């Protein structure tokens, strides 16, 4: 949903690991089986991700993604709920901002001293702001390929000197602009302590069925002669299905003071079919314009490697490497380096902090994700 630099400052500080490593309450969103690693009691977590991006040769500004968690740990069970947000933008510009708020309902169980199982069911709210410029040639290539339809086509081609159509659907540029939808996702994982120092973990993340995103949009016809004629109406996006993913990984704790974790993850873009329809209906007339953009993606592999050193009773230090690349059934991979630390102000109060620098690819893409969280733990153990 994000970009697996991980979930929370402990995972992100270690390059994205978490299939077998106790990343805290964020395990709800990675491998919920790891929640059995948390101490008994009640855990409240507050944090956010602060993403600033830069692109050499679309807002760079600080994106803020908050995370809330409540986890109960007693005996063999863990129960959790939270709210995990992601924010970011892709690319009269062509752009898409995607907001995903995932609200897990999570549980985990120690089957025995070696085997832990866990699952989450997400309620998922997806929101997209977008702008899409289509010139006269592109409309043509797409009208002859049977990809544009709707009674708005002939009236638009008859705009004098028509140069481009602009689909705008943005909360920030017009009130109620954008589209949104509630949906459902989830994950099912386990951990296995096969060796006293080596734990292995596996989690399958389900395909998120987001369902039809609806809302408001403007379609502006651009003409040097006739001005920019905006038409207002309803917009519907059709077939989204965030892809399933499989994460397998291992944690090795040479001592309580020093651990290393490594994870491998396959994201299954190829099994998301592509019927991605875009329909706009003009609110005065009921005249519509229909549009397909079936864009296929290939599977992605991600490798995550990090380490953690407990220094004294209050300080923990982390570092990690992250490598994402298209999959085996020619592309530049994305690499990221990370570091982080934790401070415990008390047995009940811990601050975690994370910094990750990523790079992709004539295009250069630089991205810094700052991650900070606070956990307040009230213990119980009877």
Residue numbers in the entry: 3 to 59, 75 to 108, 127 to 364, 373 to 404, 419 to 439
Manuscript excerpt for this entry:
Thus far, only the FadL OM channel family has been shown to mediate transport of hydrophobics. PpF1 has three FadL orthologs, of which TodX (Pput_2883) and CymD (Pput_2901) are located in the adjacent tod and cym/cmt operons respectively. Here we show, by using an integrated approach combining growth assays, X-ray crystallography and molecular dynamics (MD) simulations, that MAH uptake as the first step in biodegradation does occur via lateral diffusion.
Despite considerable efforts, we could only obtain one crystal form that diffracted to sufficient resolution for structure determination. Importantly however, the visible parts of the structure show that the S2 bulge and the S3 kink are present and in the same location as in TodX. To allow molecular dynamics simulations, we modelled the missing parts of CymD by using the TodX structure as a template. Growth on p-cymene vapour is observed only with CymD, and the CymD lateral opening mutants have the same phenotypes with toluene and p-cymene. Interestingly, the equivalent sphincter residues in CymD are Ala3, Val106 and Ile373, suggesting that the passage from the P-pocket to the lateral opening is narrower in TodX compared to CymD. Due to the difficulties in crystallising wild-type CymD and its similarity to TodX, no attempts were made to crystallise CymD lateral opening mutants.
